[PDB]
């Protein structure tokens, strides 16, 4: 992993800044890679970012990436650099249990121009875009955080609970590894 | 054969064009899968312009609809929604289309293969695979079909302006080669 955290408890609304951590610079420029997160939510917020990487400055609220969960057992991601540039999304319903640990992962595979989302030992969605993008295509990325997404200096999409384990890889893990690692 | 077809329809921005009473509309309102092919010319700067929508126009049901849309930045996309707790499937492709010019786009929703594919001007531009495949028949309380907008609580949302030159809806799932040919 280029960045890893474990056992991080987050109060709803606060987030947990990773922007100064060794490895954060690498995460802020990812051209592809893999993100694996085990978590337990205690929040009823409708959209809860587990990990985000983006531009937190004024007027750049549509320039970010996040991997998120919902209050209805959903898992998704959005990858955005304003709608005119790109708004790539995956949103999967009823993928996890709607006080229970879950493990999710996102793979972004530049060679295949594919994004794959996994939850609890299952591939739940795949996206192929003619114009592949990732974090390095977002303009002005300046922050990495757990448990929310910075939008004009405000913590948006606020998570509450535990980030049990978070790992970010520059490498693109195989579908078998991700089935295995997102299992029990 | 198409189950619903219209040609040479002008629409001023905000007006829409109701198809709800047309023979074939009932079939469109219950599609479990199918194919939509549309040639159009937009004259509107609206950011999101529905070419064709099928949904629930009643109050409180503004997140229960399907539409195939274009943007003011050369984008093409679709959203398929039955409130966020149930499903919100979005495929949004930037810079897919380009004196104003005519463009031809298509969406294929393939139940057997649990896939959605979007085409523009002779090219496959995106593919979405979802473990929980959904289509129009999964939306609750569908009561209308229209060109040039989406009914949300009795208001024309996502308003298109310009010409719907040719619009066809099929219950059949056309081949990728057919769609490359008909859109190009």
Numbering used by the authors:
A (entry chain B): 8 to 105, 111 to 196
B (entry chain A): 7 to 104, 110 to 195
What sentences appear in the manuscript?
RgCBM40 crystallised as a dimer, adopting the canonical CBM40 β-sandwich fold with six antiparallel strands on the convex face and five on the concave face (for data collection and refinement statistics). Electron density was observed for all RgCBM40 residues present in the construct (50–237). The sialic acid binding site is on the concave face at the dimer interface, however, size exclusion chromatography with multi angle light scattering (SEC-MALS) indicated that the full-length protein, RgNanH, is monomeric in solution. The SEC-MALS predicted molecular weight was 73 kDa, indicating that RgNanH is monomeric in solution. The macromolecular architecture of RgCBM40 is conserved among members of the CBM40 family, with the exception of Vibrio cholerae CBM40_NanH (VcCBM40_NanH) which is proposed to be part of a separate CBM40 subfamily. No significant conformational changes were observed in the binding site upon ligand binding.
